[PDB]
Write a protein that binds this DNA or RNA. Structure first.
Ligand SMILES: [Mn+2]
Length: 664
RNA sequence: UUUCC
């Protein structure tokens, strides 16, 4: 297709994305920035002692605890699935350059031999059925907003009062805005109600990424991460180039005088997108009720909490297949957006709301700073949104879009390769709805537990079982993609939402158990994705509000990992060698301090009652709110704790809004 | 804070 139009920041189309206030203006111009993070209060990620510690711990653990993953990617034994060199990154310093987001993924999908629409009428009915079951009998709830999160385009406000006003105003004018859009008046909808414009593209760190130690050379090698330059991004890959970013950290020495030990690299950086809040609010007001519905009625498939919660479902299976999806967000198909919108209209959803929804999935993107001297460019024209970026992480229902796509993708996979006998049950909408309603409740011989791009597919005893083994074998072979919709493979070291499925000698689900991933404990403790932001007075607004609290939930979260004790002892030993102090004592102090600080934020919490009323989930979330995005949901956290991290808009205002959106 | 869901 055509190249997407691009506008420099000086152009009026990009200028219009940033309000006439300092924050917005600074956000538009912010140049590439890097620097060591404050891993913990008073400790830099590049502190010589800390890097020495990481070098000793990483080698030691890898040495003594080699991965235990079989030929089918099932993990067993020590519950270790890879080496421990992932911790060897100079946290805060990114690979250069970060990628330019692809303005269109049509070609990327076509070239990967993925379909440009439902391949059969059956699939078409299943995707639409997914829409009818998910968006049908919704109950209004307060629109909850994350504290400290930015409203992005055009105001970039982080003020709760301002966010609540923006959100309330948005639920009030959404109808008018959507109708303007239905008339092709996007500039009007944006100018009047700030609904439109673009996603603000930021780069986030994936603090740990694969690193291997070459036996032959004795040198460490970081996994190459391919990035697209501007030409490639605007032409959907027809021109320009895709090349490996540089993770080499040598530069830190001459540039900053930072000492770079051997085998330490710059961090992998991923794109994140901040949505224009006025547009997302009306979307989030529907999205939450949808989540509430699927996590309740379809809890079997979609509601995952503890490792035992997962385990109970999986141990009833005769076969469990741990899938992997390649680059889910960028391959997400715009045809599914259009299918979902079309089906919502068929269900009687307000056209103006569906239009807001459709538009949220075609919005231009404003690229900030992928590298020194690059960026500050708007891709796509906000006057007529027509990008096909795949799925924007900042869209108000991103989790649901990925979940709807994949859940049906896996079911189709199970039907195609193992359960032809179930096809006669999917003949029209009613029967498709009935079958999907039953499958999602775990009532069929083929099952799944999934979230966005993570899942485990199951087969009980029955006719499909033999096909299930063939599918598994096909995946192991890795020669033929089992799906026409996304690039599916098997996970090397099967895990689901953070918990590794630990298999015994029988290599069967019934005798397998879910254990915490010890490598994630290390990632969270020694390679956080953000510094402690000690300059942000209000801790509820920080990326890591109460880092110390994770120590109190550690045993609960990682206690079942086979080498749990071993890792804690190796840490203690190496921290001793590097700092001359006890890591455990260090964490107990942090734990006490954050525990005291926390009572300042929790009203119900006695001005010093312990952590007695808090669950392990509560703790992990207070230390890392991001887990409330990729792992758990509001309902999994104690109510008094939830209020620490979120604030809501009146139920009355959303109720009125929701009534005007929904069919009946 | 220096920008996400
Ligand atoms: Mn998985």
């Amino acid at each position: 297709p055509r190249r997407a139009p691009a506008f420099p920041l000086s152009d009026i189309k990009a200028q219009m994305l940033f309000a006439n206030n300092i924050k917005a203006q600074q956000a538009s111009k912010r140049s590439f920035k890097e620097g060591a993070i404050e891993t913990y209060e008073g400790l830099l990620s590049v502190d010589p002692r800390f890097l020495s510690f990481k070098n000793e711990l990483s080698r030691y653990l890898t040495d003594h605890f080699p991965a235990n993953v079989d030929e089918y990617g099932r993990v067993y034994g020590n519950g270790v699935r890879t080496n421990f060199f992932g911790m060897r990154h100079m946290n805060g310093f990114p690979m250069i350059p970060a990628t330019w987001p692809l303005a269109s993924n049509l070609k990327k999908r076509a070239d990967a031999d993925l379909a440009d629409g439902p391949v059969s009428e059956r699939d078409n009915l299943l995707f639409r059925a997914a829409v009818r079951l998910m968006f049908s009998d919704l109950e209004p709830v307060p629109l909850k907003i994350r504290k400290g999160s930015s409203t992005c385009i055009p105001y970039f406000s982080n003020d709760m009062g301002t966010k609540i006003e923006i959100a309330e105003r948005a639920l009030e004018k959404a109808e008018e805005a959507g109708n303007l859009m239905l008339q092709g008046k996007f500039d009007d909808a944006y100018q009047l109600h700030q609904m439109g414009g673009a996603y603000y593209v930021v780069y986030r760190a994936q603090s740990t990424d694969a690193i291997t130690l070459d036996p032959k050379t004795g040198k460490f090698v970081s996994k190459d991460r391919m990035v697209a330059d501007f030409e490639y991004a605007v032409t959907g890959g027809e021109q320009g180039s895709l090349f490996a970013a540089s993770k080499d950290a040598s530069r830190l020495k001459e540039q900053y005088g930072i000492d770079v030990p051997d085998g330490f690299f710059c961090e992998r950086r991923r794109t994140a997108m901040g949505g224009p809040f006025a547009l997302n609010a009306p979307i989030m007001a529907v999205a939450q009720p949808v989540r509430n519905k699927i996590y309740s009625k379809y809890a079997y498939t979609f509601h995952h909490t503890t490792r035992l919660n997962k385990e109970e479902k999986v141990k009833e299976w005769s076969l469990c297949v741990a899938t992997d999806v390649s680059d889910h967000d960028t391959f997400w198909p715009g045809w599914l957006r259009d299918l979902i919108c079309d089906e919502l209209l068929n269900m009687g959803y307000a056209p103006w709301w569906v239009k807001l929804f459709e538009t949220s999935l075609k919005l231009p993107v404003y690229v900030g700073a992928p590298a020194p001297e690059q960026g500050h460019t708007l891709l796509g024209d906000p006057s007529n949104p027509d990008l096909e970026v795949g799925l924007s992480s900042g869209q108000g229902a991103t989790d649901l879009m990925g979940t709807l796509l994949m859940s049906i993708t896996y079911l189709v996979m199970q039907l195609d390769h193992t359960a032809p006998h179930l096809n006669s049950r999917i003949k029209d909408m009613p029967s498709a709805c009935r079958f999907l309603d039953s499958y999602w409740q775990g009532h069929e011989e083929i099952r799944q537990i999934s979230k966005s791009d993570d899942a485990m597919l199951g087969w009980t005893k029955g006719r499909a079982l033999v096909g299930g083994h063939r599918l598994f074998e096909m995946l192991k072979e890795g020669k033929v993609n089992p799906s026409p919709y996304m690039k599916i493979s098997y996970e090397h070291g099967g895990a689901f939402l953070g918990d590794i499925l630990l298999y015994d000698s029988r290599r069967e689900p019934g005798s397998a158990i879910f254990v915490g991933n010890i490598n994630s404990m290390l990632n969270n403790q020694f390679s956080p994705e953000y510094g402690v932001q000690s300059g942000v007075r209000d801790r509820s607004k920080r990326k890591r509000p109460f880092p110390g609290l994770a120590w109190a939930s550690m045993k609960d979260t990682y206690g079942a990992c086979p080498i749990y004790s071993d890792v804690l002892e190796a840490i203690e030993r190496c921290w001793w060698n590097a700092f001359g102090e006890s890591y455990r004592a260090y964490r107990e102090d942090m734990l006490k301090r954050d525990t005291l600080e926390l009572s300042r934020y929790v009203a119900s919490m006695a001005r010093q009652a312990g952590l007695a009323e808090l669950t392990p989930i509560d703790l992990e979330v207070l230390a890392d709110p991001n887990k409330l995005q990729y792992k758990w949901t509001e309902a999994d956290v104690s109510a008094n704790i939830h209020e620490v991290l979120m604030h809501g808009v009146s139920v009355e205002k959303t109720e009125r809004f929701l009534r005007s959106v929904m069919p009946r």
